[PDB]
Amino acid sequence: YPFWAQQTYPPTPREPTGRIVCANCHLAAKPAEVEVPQSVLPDTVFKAVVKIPYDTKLQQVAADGSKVGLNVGAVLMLPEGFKIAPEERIPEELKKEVGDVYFQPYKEGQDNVLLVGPLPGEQYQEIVFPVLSPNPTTDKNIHFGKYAIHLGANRGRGQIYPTGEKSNNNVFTASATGTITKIAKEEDEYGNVKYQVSIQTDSGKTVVDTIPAGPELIVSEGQAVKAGEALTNNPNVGGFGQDDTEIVLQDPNRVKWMIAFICLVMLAQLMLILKKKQVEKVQAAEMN
């Protein structure tokens, strides 16, 4: 979860390569988008939409085994002193689509990298960030310009605990290599079910191989398929996205003179072509 990102990787969610640490545990890949407009003006509330699509009507494996809906997380990282819009200022239908979300900052001070989630899958198909542009006229190391924004979003539960052990939403190899002896089925007054399998004859050969509850097995009886294998099948309907995107923090002034300089041009251009015409005419008095 977004929090254990923070928890495990304190000063940043992204490495120098652009990865985003999240992808260390969430092993699946599924697409993530991130729209925001092409330009904002300074001091402005504006929307940024995170997208995290997954096929709504299907289910993943849970802790113990059940077979439950699922949840989107996501860290987004806005450019320098962008921050979530202060709330008197979000206006209205926006309040509404933002919903009930928690925009938590990746470390004290960095308001511009926000963790978000675990939200529940079905209303958080798309996730809105109401955000507000800095103002380079008043914060004196914010300049106008074009800047990057990076999302990495994930949806559905992951493959490794922040503690270092495997979850059950992956798929177990087979330790050594030989002929299997026993598909037991544990369920001790707690920590539920437990398919207990093991291999043999060859050389040494009695190694034991438990495998949590909620994968399948699709490897049955007899057998010996080699060095850590098939046995499980793939529980994991989950997984992780990434997106980068540009945004220009524009200054209306630049826009204003630009527009002026253009008309100044268009005008000149017609004015020449006008001249030319007036010459095509003094010329017609020079063939005859």
């Binding site: 008309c263 006008l274 005419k281």
Partner: protein, 32 residues
């Protein structure tokens, strides 16, 4: 989109105006 489309129409329009207009002014005080 709808906004550009307008501003856009008006903007060309307007110059197209000046264009045509100023031929004529320019034609009939006989400069062209």
């Amino acid at each position: 989109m709808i906004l550009g489309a307008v501003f856009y129409i008006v903007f060309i329009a307007l110059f197209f105006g000046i264009a045509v207009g100023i031929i004529f002014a320019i034609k009939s005080i006989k400069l062209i």
